Structure 1
Amino acid sequence: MLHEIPKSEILKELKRIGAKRVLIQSPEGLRREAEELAGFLEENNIEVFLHGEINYGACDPADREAKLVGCDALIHLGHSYMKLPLEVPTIFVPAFARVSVVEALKENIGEIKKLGRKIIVTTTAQHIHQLKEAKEFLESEGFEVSIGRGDSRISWPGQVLGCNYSVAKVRGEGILFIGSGIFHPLGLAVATRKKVLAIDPYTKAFSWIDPERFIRKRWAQIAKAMDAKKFGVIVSIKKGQLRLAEAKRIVKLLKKHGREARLIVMNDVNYHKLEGFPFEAYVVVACPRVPLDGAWRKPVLTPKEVEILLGLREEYEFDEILGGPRESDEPFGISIHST
């Protein structure tokens, strides 16, 4: 149950823009929402194309596609804006979960107290609108609450992304993560070297994160790759994912240590498509989620990991795509940007 799509506000925005034809991208959970929204906008004399790709982030706006098919503007359902060049005017429609964060915290006060007095609090987009309540509740429980602004890849203070934990690079004794899954909490534990407690607002369940099992698991992939001679080094052309210079660097670095390395260019980074190439191992220089989150035949490493493989790095490190300083914050609802 999400906060409902603001069809009205959206339409008012197109009207202003003087947009006649639009493309709508949507994530897996919002497909039916996407069409419903389309019918409505066509009822009001606007032509709507739907994007057929399942979208996974604002790091991947379908603006170039919009341009190609002659669209005036892009609607991006389900995510907030991260700083990118956009080729047509784009309306972002953050989706906010309705579930009560504070109820989930109230059931777990005792666990949260094991974190310390001054704590760092983090969450995901789906809960960012209740972070102020969550902070006020925690302060009313005796905690000092530390929340980081984050960099240009982040939309709001306290928000973490799979590739980015800059909001957690602040002073504090322990880290509270509000949301589901163990990937972010794990990412936080490794990136900060702090104790991490994760609370799932849906289930009210909690997890104390231990990164050592993960780090050991990664080290076995690094070990397998120790004897590899031939590497493929992968980039993604997604607007917010391309990391050419870094991939070039990794290529040069593997060669200098007597390996062969070839840069490979993809869109969706997908092991399957690579099975015929002659390479013995892979380095993904895109979004950390791909390799870290373990079913590929050959080893696949992040750029940090390959630095360890070549013994130019000693401690394990999570791969993050960092942004630049962020001027202001995004709104808790619709926003529109253009270039």
Structure 2
Amino acid sequence: FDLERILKTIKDKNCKKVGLQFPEGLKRQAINIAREIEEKTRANVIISGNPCFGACDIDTILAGSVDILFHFGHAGMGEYENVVFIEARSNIDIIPAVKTALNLLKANRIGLITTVQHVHKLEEACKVIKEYGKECVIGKGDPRAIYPGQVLGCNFTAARVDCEEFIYIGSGIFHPLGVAIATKKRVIAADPFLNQAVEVSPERFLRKRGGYIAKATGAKIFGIIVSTKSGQYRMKLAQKLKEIADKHGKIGYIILMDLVTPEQLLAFKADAYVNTACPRITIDDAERFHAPVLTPQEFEIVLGERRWENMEMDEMIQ
């Protein structure tokens, strides 16, 4: 990533103190970057040592005690006074993986989505698809993120476009799964780190979640989990869910925490939990919890306030 701009920014503004925040994969570079900033500018650097899961997870205590917080690795989320997002993009060629998925397309209007690592390469991919003879749309998502076509585990607005199928560019199965479910459209996952392209079927995902719903039908006491992280806090929803719970003869207790981990939930024995924090906790960490952990809408289905056929992906709406 572009360290020269960071130094120029600091050096132009005569920053007394500078803050650095890294996602877990980038922390190994934190000390090298702080060295570069202290060597080449006059600012003192404070490093954030908490786990950081994304731009939903800004260290606002550190931002409020430094002149500028550089948050690395993610597209911007929200609107912060003195937080500067440093994007950190990937070099990997995605066009070989794009052409691979072209042989699986069964429609002519193709929507393109990807993650922040690859978003600067979508236009290239859009022109390959268009020369192959197809139409290609890239929707706009979070307006506070400079690049369109970007999806998050909690945000599928870049997939709400006039198109027939989607090519998702990236690794991992969660995002194309969520798009498929949120759009009811066919999603082809093109992994550029493998030069392979496969269709994603959400039926297996949907069966597993129906199993957690079924598994919680007998639950009487629910822990409703709230996170204080800057972009994950949904207390208003949590209080509605408590009221819904009580309306159906069940009991919910609101548990407010920072990190949402199986170990901390194990300390409060309830029959099931409802996670209003990061939606990916519910899915990626499902098997690590000692009792069923439900999205807010799955909870509604468990109590009767929503029908199974209306189950939507959990999306971050604070």
- Normalising by the smaller structure, the TM-score range is over 0.9
Change (3 A) 1:107 1:220: closer
Moved more, 289-298 or 12-21: 12-21
Name the CA distance, whole Å, in 2 between partners of 1:16 and 1:304. Answer: 49
3-state SS of the aligned residue for 2:92? coil
Which residue does the alignment assign to 1:52? 49
Q: Using CA pairs below 8 Å that are at least 6 residues apart, which structure has the higher relative contact order?
A: 1
2:8 alignment counterpart: 12
The answer as to whether partners of 1:154 and 1:160 remain within 8 angstroms in 2 is no
**Aligned: 1:217 with 2:208:** yes
Q: Check the 8 A contact 2:60/2:230 in 1, yes or no.
A: no
Gaps of 5+ in 1: 324-339
Residues 222-270 of structure 1, C-alpha deviations (whole Å, 9 max, x = no match) = 1111011100101110111101111100010001000011111011111
Q: Tell me if the contact between 2:14 and 2:42 (Cα under 8 Å) persists in the aligned partners.
A: no
Between the aligned partners of 1:7 and 1:65, the Cα distance in structure 2 is 20
- 1:261 is aligned to 2:252: yes
Percent same amino acid at aligned positions? 42
Mapped pair 1:158 → 2:155: no
RMSD: 1.5
- Higher mean alpha-carbon deviation, 260-269 vs 54-63, is at 54-63
Residues 134-170 of structure 1: per-residue CA shift (max 9 Å, x gap) = 0011101111011111134654210001101001111
2:275 corresponds to 1:275: no
1:105 aligns with 2:105: no
Is residue 17–residue 46 contact of structure 2 (8 Å, CA) maintained in 1? yes
The answer as to 2:65 corresponding to 1:74 is no
Q: Note the C-alpha offset of 1:109.
A: 2.5
1:155 to 1:266, Cα distance in 2 relative to 1, 3 A: farther
Which residue identity lines up with residue 11 of structure 2 in the other structure? K
Larger deviation, residues 204-213 vs 27-36:
27-36
How far residue 287 of structure 1 moved from its aligned partner, in angstroms, is: 1.4
Corresponding residue for 1:250?
241
Match of 2:26 in 1: 30
Find out whether 1:92 has 2:114 as its counterpart. no
Match of 1:178, as an amino acid? Answer: I
- The two structures have a TM-score, normalised by structure 2, of 0.94
- AA in 1 matched with 2:208: K
Encode CA deviations 1:183-214: one digit per residue, 9 max, x unaligned. 00110011000011100011112221111111
Instruction: Give the 3 Å change call, closer, same or farther, for CA 206–155 of structure 1 in structure 2.
Output: same
Whole-Å separation in 2 of the counterparts to 1:244 and 1:79: 25
Matched residues in 2 for 1:9 and 1:283: separation?
43
What amino acid does structure 2 have at the position aligned with 1:303?
P
Q: Which residue of 2 aligns with 1:312?
A: 305
Displacement of 1:25: 0.7
Residues 22 and 46 in structure 1, CA contact (< 8 A), matched pair in contact too: yes
Runs of 5+ unmatched residues, structure 2: none
Question: SS at the partner of 2:103?
Answer: helix
> Stretches of 4+ moved more than 6 A in 1?
none
- Residues 228, 257 of structure 2: 8 Å contact kept: yes
Contact 2:156–2:182 (CA under 8 A) maintained in structure 1: yes
Deviates more, 1:98-107 or 1:300-309: 98-107
The amino acid of 1:35's aligned partner reads I
How far apart, CA to CA, are the structure 2 residues paired with 1:312 and 1:105?
Answer: 42
Give runs of aligned pairs for residues 61-210 of structure 1, distance below 5 A: 61-67=58-64, 70-86=65-81, 89-111=82-104, 113-114=105-106, 116-152=107-143, 154-210=145-201
Is residue 153–residue 322 contact of structure 1 (8 Å, CA) maintained in 2? no
Task: Give the counterpart letter for 1:71 in structure 2.
Answer: V
Offset at 1:122?
A: 0.5
Equivalent residue letter for 2:302: L
